[PDB]
Design a binder for these strands. Structure first.
Ligand SMILES: [Mg+2]
Ligand SMILES: [Mg+2]
Ligand SMILES: [Mg+2]
Ligand SMILES: [Zn+2]
Lengths: 134, 136, 135, 38, 94
RNA sequence: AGCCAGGAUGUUGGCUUAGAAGCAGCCAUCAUUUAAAGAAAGCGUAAUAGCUCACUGGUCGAGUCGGCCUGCGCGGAAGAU
């Protein structure tokens, strides 16, 4: 049960992971293609947090999440770095409508939050990252 | 090290070191290293303690040295008999009496000052204590 | 002041919460993973149920000024208590489902109508319908 | 072990103990921290 | 706010003062105004605690001797050269 | 103090890197849910799983921490018939 195989848009993620999943007898090629077919609608450069579940029965049980918020930069901010030194520079600004769109997008994952509190929560990440609003 | 740029006389009598000290209060900084014991503070010891403090605070804040070595100490050359005049000046000391404030510090936290003064005190031949600036 | 002030305050928050609270269902809170309570806590938020745990002593001082002298007997060991501040009832059922289906504590007590509800008689509050039924 | 005039705790796991009229430092973590006053 | 109990000294001088300081007391002087200065003695540890608070050197202090109370201010203090102790204190009548 | 439980979400924070997920390094260190929980105190690891600390509730039931002044002791303390 370890988060791995992100960027589902790129097939066979052996170079990043490699011998990490060699402990589990999981077909790297076969499962990667199957996950691609299930979730090929997303953008190619989008990570998906997935786990590798092992039990006595060796029955895989996986549930899909939302792409991480940080890779969510080219949607409105149009940046790929944010800041080598965060809060010391300025590369862009995020519109109030954008994070709210992510707010309902990520509402299925926030363990504890309200619609308003989640919006205030994800703006904290943007401020600490370097993005601003208003 | 510290030594007078010039002096009225080259050599000085041995003298004595009786009495208590003048300059017992923290006058410039906010923390001070007060001398409890009595004795001589050579220029080398004063410099050695100064470096220990200065590196401990990483050259932050301000440091005052309240003592100056102005008494010349002479020594005859090795394997030389008595008499034939007074020996040659070898180093300079400062006479220390109990209660003398030797070093002062400012611009650093009190705890950092304590360890900084503790490191210097290990370089001195005289028992010392940590004192703080007092109102009146 | 410090933490004594904070505990004096801690009683204050639960005190005025109990002023607006209508029905109380007390349960236990031990041996269960914290992330598992996310389901009940989210349910309380959306169903207007407020939950909190003060010490047996803070629980002792905090209910004398509110009409809650009925449930004084069941204050032994850990005391989780949730308060329905709106849409009264529908709390015993919300806890029964999580209790019987997870192999843990059944129930501690309840509080309604100015009288204590025993453990075996909580079905009335579990089966109690919503306030909107006169229509 | 270290035999020295000044023995002191070198980490949070060191303990000052007096065992036969001598002061000792015993460490559950670092065997290098074992000292004795002598 | 700061009230100090005091006793009038019956013997003065170098020897008497040292005996006082050995007995965990210390002398002090109250002067100012049109009346003669009054030499009194203070118990060291209690005054040592109050003088730690800075307000002691700024506010009006009250000294009680023979029941009578005098409002004074700390005019000057003589500390031990290297020990955390007080040797003498000057009080000016407020 | 000991013992029990928890130590979560965003999130693998941003940058860097082959990888850098609290834990090589650089910058930031906010926001929620909270009873608490650091953008992580130490071990870990190719990178992560994993251990544990801070922190919080429970048990226990009365003292408990660290300075200051001071009396007497301890170590420091090895030589030759
Ligand atoms: Mg033995
Ligand atoms: Mg005499
Ligand atoms: Mg000795
Ligand atoms: Zn150690």
């Amino acid at each position: 049960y370890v988060k791995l195989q992100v960027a589902a848009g790129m097939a066979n993620p052996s170079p990043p992971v490699g011998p990490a999943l060699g402990q589990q007898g999981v077909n790297i090629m076969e499962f990667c293609k199957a996950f691609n077919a299930k979730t090929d609608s997303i953008e190619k450069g989008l990570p998906i947090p997935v786990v590798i579940t092992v039990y006595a029965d060796r029955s895989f049980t996986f549930v899909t999440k939302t792409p991480p918020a940080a890779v969510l930069l080219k949607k409105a901010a149009g940046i790929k770095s944010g800041s080598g030194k965060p809060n010391k520079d300025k590369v862009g600004k995020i519109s109030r409508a954008q994070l709210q769109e992510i707010a309902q997008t990520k509402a299925a994952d926030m363990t504890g939050a309200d619609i308003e509190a989640m919006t205030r929560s994800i703006e904290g990440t943007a401020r600490s990252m370097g993005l601003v609003v208003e | 090290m510290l030594q007078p740029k010039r002096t009225k006389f080259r050599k000085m009598h041995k003298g004595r070191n009786r009495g208590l000290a003048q300059g017992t209060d923290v006058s410039f900084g906010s923390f001070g290293l007060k001398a409890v014991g009595r004795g001589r503070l050579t220029a080398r010891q004063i410099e050695a303690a100064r470096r220990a403090m200065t590196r401990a605070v990483k050259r932050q804040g301000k440091i005052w040295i309240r003592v100056f070595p102005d008494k010349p100490i002479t020594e005859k050359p090795l394997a030389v008999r008595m008499g034939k005049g007074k020996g040659n000046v070898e180093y300079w000391v400062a006479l220390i009496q109990p209660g003398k404030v030797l070093y002062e510090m400012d611009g650093v936290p009190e705890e950092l000052a304590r360890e900084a003064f503790k490191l210097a005190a290990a370089k001195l031949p005289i028992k010392t204590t940590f004192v703080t600036k007092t109102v009146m | 002041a410090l933490n004594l002030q904070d505990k004096q305050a801690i009683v204050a928050e639960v005190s005025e919460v109990a002023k607006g609270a209508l029905s109380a269902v007390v349960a236990d809170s031990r041996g269960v993973t914290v992330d598992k309570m996310t389901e009940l806590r989210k349910a309380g938020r959306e169903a207007g149920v407020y939950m909190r745990v003060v010490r047996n002593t803070l629980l002792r001082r905090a209910v004398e000024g509110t009409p809650f002298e009925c449930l004084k007997d069941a204050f032994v060991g850990p005391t989780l208590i949730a308060y329905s501040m709106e849409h009264p009832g529908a709390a015993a059922r919300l806890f029964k489902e999580f209790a019987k289906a997870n192999a843990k504590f059944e129930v501690k007590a309840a509080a309604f109508e100015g009288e204590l509800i025993p453990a075996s008689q909580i079905d009335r509050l579990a089966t109690l319908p919503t306030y909107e039924e006169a229509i | 072990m270290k035999v020295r005039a000044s023995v002191k705790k070198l980490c949070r796991n060191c303990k000052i103990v007096k065992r036969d009229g001598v002061i000792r430092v015993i460490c559950s973590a670092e065997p290098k921290h074992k000292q004795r006053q002598g | 706010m700061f009230t100090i109990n005091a006793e009038v000294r019956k013997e003065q001088g170098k020897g008497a003062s040292r005996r006082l300081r050995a007995a965990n007391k210390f002398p002090a002087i109250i002067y100012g105004g049109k009346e003669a200065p009054l030499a009194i003695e203070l118990d060291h540890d209690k005054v040592m605690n109050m003088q730690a608070k800075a307000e002691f050197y700024s506010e009006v202090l009250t000294i009680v001797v023979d029941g009578k109370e005098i409002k004074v201010k700390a005019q000057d203090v003589q500390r031990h050269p290297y020990k955390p102790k007080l040797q003498h204190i000057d009080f000016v009548r407020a």
